Amino acid sequence: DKATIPSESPFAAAEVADGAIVVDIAKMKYETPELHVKVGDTVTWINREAMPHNVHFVAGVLGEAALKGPMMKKEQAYSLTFTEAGTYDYHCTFHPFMRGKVVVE
Ligand SMILES: [Cu+2]
Fold this sequence. Notes:
Layout: E1 3-4, E2 11-12, E3 21-26, E4 29-30, E5 34-37, E6 42-47, E7 56-57, E8 67-68, E9 76-82, E10 86-91, E11 99-104
Parallel strand pairs: 3-6, 5-11
Antiparallel strand pairs: 1-9, 2-9, 3-4, 6-9, 7-8, 10-11
This protein binds copper (II) ion (CU).
């Protein structure tokens, strides 16, 4: 697979590292919808609002099967560590019109 998962479940936003590469989710949007990182980087999404959200990569993007991230409540976080160069699109399971991508250089 093309990413590893440091936290299987959502975790508290207060425990996101200071350093971390963060994508906020707010107002029904990913607030960095075209994020550029490098091989080896960890990305952390943080839901900033009451409406639940996730991140969801369809089958074949990060692995043979889909990666459907866990449901994230307000001030919950979820991370992926990207290990292979490429561009990886995702959406929100609940709200598929909400889309983003991670461009891994
Ligand atoms: Cu959503």
